[PDB]
Design a protein around this ligand. Structure first.
Ligand code: PRO
Ligand code: PRO
Ligand code: PRO
Ligand code: PRO
Ligand SMILES: [Zn+2]
Ligand SMILES: [Zn+2]
Ligand SMILES: [Zn+2]
Ligand SMILES: [Zn+2]
Lengths: 308, 308, 308, 308
């Protein structure tokens, strides 16, 4: 398995909004088409959210994933990874209900409580926002992603009992330290899939020294018992992916994380970012991991051992 | 002013509790005695909280500082720095009322929302906790220090209008990035007093690479328009102070931040930690800054230009 | 010039020897064909050495470049960069005679005296060595590349007078500090073309922390007044090229530096390595620099201002 | 041994010259008095050179150490460490003759060939130079310290057979990689005493990032099997000593390395610099190591197992 790079594709998320790009997937069929195309392009892991079809706003309910998960699984053996994020006012118990019911191989896990903002972008996007929910959100200077020590323990115990393992999303150094606290307690066992997230407002930035700091910290705290992946937000996406691939890590792309392709051009598909990351991986002389290889690298339970 | 090291002394805080050490100052007279002794030992800046005298629990009200601030100022020309922290349930408007009324030269400003915990220490301290509030607090796995982008802007505008400048407490890289957002908007002007805080559960750790990462980040984002200070929590206090002093930075000590002296011995006074930091500073061939020197280095309004 | 990446191709050098790979160019026509193929693949700068045609040993004489330089210039607008290296017993005056006579736009300049060794490969390669000079060289534990402060000054003054600018080869941190000494004296003017060389025995290694250390050091010492390129020796070539490209730097490839392609195979051409670098550059959404773009970025005198 | 800091004192060396400071020890009795005073102040290891008494020039002959070693041993239990440096034209066999004959517990070992220079100080110091040898040396732009792979191997095998262990002087990253080559071959066994040297012209600089780079590199290459000491040349001496002590490392001081005390004054004794380091060590709450503690930490043969 040496020299195999796992590409995760995060297809729509909850941070970007439909007025920001006509290519952001909104309907269940757009999301499944995006996931299937990304998997066919080489993404072994698909990170999934759902949205309301009427206005594109985030929908974290159990049933919102019903027309998503089985459709993708029928078409692709990719590893499906269900978010545990949600609105700042939603309880951790409600946020984990989709992963608790579907028992996926992976669920995402944000490792700390943090501010988040997109309000600096209001000058560029306000005139094109079509829905009031987007105006309310983009203008909100009081957003927190809440993931207390007690919340994270609850997710680890409750979802871990169903065989789900985590994409541990770590947005700054303290998230790696928080993860070390739970790893030393035995609440999660290795190999840990650690997704270090760069460039978001409220998180660490995307400078090369930020990337190496996160890598050095994770190496020191976890040794060989983790698998490193990077998420470079926005136009950092491919620069940070190339650093990770060149350093022995794995790569996350997707329209959840970056709407752009080049100088002012929007990305039209998730598959197009997978293809770019694959060009970098293969240019290095490495190979993209298949879903079966990713399941071995991440010690996952199998695409059949799920409730969909 | 080159080669002058500002020692800040944080005398009691709100993180440690009285059952943890009989030397933690609780009454207003204990706090003023601690501040005056620390200033006489060489601390040019005193970071202040108040407590209820009956049970030692934190007291963030305006009047709790009345028997503190004028008493210290009568005895010492040190710069008095009032906290803006408070219970996780207290609004930012209520948290800033003491600094808003007293118009101090400095107030503290936490730069992001973060988890915090002391619950891992429950096994060592539970049997000695005398007050139920300490049991409730030490056992709480859901503590957040809330400092949203909107909260921080409110503090900057409201307290800045009274001439107060900030001790910007930055507990991880993202806090430096958050501060850069407000600095670029002009909401705070340099020189920025940046207190990088190491070793707390919920914050960055205290490894030497953490220290250098925070320093490099601040240098890149702020250039020469800041003054660096370090706070090493707990038994990291003097190791991190010595790194900063040897690198051109300033130093924070105090029982708010570290209860210990050596191998299992509690520190008996704040002045004793000031004396240790002063031994390191002078051993380097440097000198401890006086309050007048600190006011020049930090561009402060003067110890007379305050409402006490 | 935003987003334009200069690819240097070093076609043969003096460190590898013919018995290590049948694809290492030896004759003048193999060296010119290699250079022209590399430039056609996208290399804007060609770093050149010559060899004796009979046994492949290094030939640093003026006339050894006569059947090389004008031939490449007639076929390609690439920038031609002449080595100033030489056998350890050759004086700096003799080493510089080729660049002194030909007055190229670029010449290489090693910034410090250092050990170098290949002897650990002797066990594997001894049986296949066809020439005694290769046995004497690979077995030599006493190799030094001599470049004293006086030597480097002589190169800077003597070749600078002919309008030649330098590829400053820096094989460790001290080489960047040596360069800073001469830059502060005004003996070289920016923009400095700094080639940081990783992975040779006797130089810095090729770990990612070594790459970021050389970048951070150069950024601190030279600011905006340099252009960074990387040389990852051996199988580090593409990993380190990808880091550089992803960080705003330029890339050096070539059979002088790395005999290998992917997965343990030898590289058949220099062009194949240029193509691999170009796949990484274009995968990042960047563009390979043309010779005219490299001349502007490096402030070079022009391909029509040379003595060939 | 937790918390015990080894102070090495290098009393005279060969880099500074008498006309730079009247306090640099020259005669055998000035060198022994300096060593005994430094050991009494707290230095557990004394790094020794000899000089010609008539003009102060370096004297690397066996017999130049005869009025030095036994005199110090009779007065102090400090570990005596004999240089293996020498004029650039002296063979490695001649350079090692003193340690070869005397079979000390420690000998110094420079791990690579490098430039060295003092010529930038010539303008300021020329008028005060009293001896022609000092003028010839300070003006020399062609100084190399020669330590090839073959040279270092010869030192390791020849002096190792007498039970001498090494102070491995590493003046840049490549020296730690050179040491790793010999350690992996088994030519030296741990624990390795690694002295990372900062700030010399021709070596790595003395910026805090240089210090952390050498520490991180040594930690990665050698793990727990080394003991780290720092040498900050010149006025960097105490800043870098403080970083090391605060990070779990050891400290080297002495007039060989730094002629200065504080605030631009020359240091009158080696003991004065030991006292300053000890003030930093004790201010940190650490303790200076005794000779017996240094022998255990460095796995030395004992002061009664030497040939003097
Ligand atoms: O999308 C997710 O899964 C995470 C939750 C916080 C922000 N994004
Ligand atoms: O004590 C203060 O001022 C800060 C507030 C959060 C934790 N400590
Ligand atoms: O090939 C060159 O130009 C350099 C000289 C020293 C080693 N390689
Ligand atoms: O003094 C010594 O032992 C080393 C040898 C090279 C420079 N200094
Ligand atoms: Zn997500
Ligand atoms: Zn406080
Ligand atoms: Zn070359
Ligand atoms: Zn020496």
């Amino acid at each position: 398995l040496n020299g195999k790079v796992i590409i995760t594709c995060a297809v729509t998320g909850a941070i970007h909004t439909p007025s920001m790009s006509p290519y952001l997937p909104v309907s269940a069929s757009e999301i499944t088409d995006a996931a299937i195309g990304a998997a066919e392009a080489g993404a072994a892991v698909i990170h999934l959210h759902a949205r309301h079809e009427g206005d594109g706003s985030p929908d974290q309910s159990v049933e919102a994933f019903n027309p998503i998960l089985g459709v993708i699984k029928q078409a692709s053996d990719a590893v499906l990874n269900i978010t545990t994020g949600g609105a700042p006012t939603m309880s951790i118990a409600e946020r984990i209900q989709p992963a608790q019911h579907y028992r996926p191989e992976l669920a995402s896990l944000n490792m700390g409580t943090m501010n988040f903002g997109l309000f600096p972008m209001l000058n560029r996007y306000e005139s094109q926002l079509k829905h009031q929910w987007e105006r309310n959100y983009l203008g909100n200077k009081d957003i927190i992603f809440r993931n207390t020590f007690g919340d994270v323990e609850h997710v680890m115990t409750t979802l871990g009992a169903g065989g789900t393992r985590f994409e541990f999303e770590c947005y700054d150094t303290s998230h790696l330290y928080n993860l070390k606290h739970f790893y030393d307690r035995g609440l999660v066992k290795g190999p840990l899939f650690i997704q270090t997230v760069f460039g978001l407002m409220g998180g660490i930035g995307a400078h090369p020294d930020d990337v190496l700091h996160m890598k050095r910290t994770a190496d020191r705290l976890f040794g060989q018992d983790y698998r490193w992946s990077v998420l470079g937000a926005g136009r950092n996406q491919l620069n940070i992916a190339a650093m990770s691939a060149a350093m022995g890590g794995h790569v996350r792309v997707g329209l959840e994380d970056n709407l752009w392709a080049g100088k002012g051009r929007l990305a039209e598909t998730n598959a197009q970012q997978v293809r770019a990351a694959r060009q970098i991986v293969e240019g290095l002389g490495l190979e993209v991991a298949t879903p079966a290889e990713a399941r071995e690298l991440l010690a996952l339970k199998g695409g059949d051992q799920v409730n969909f």
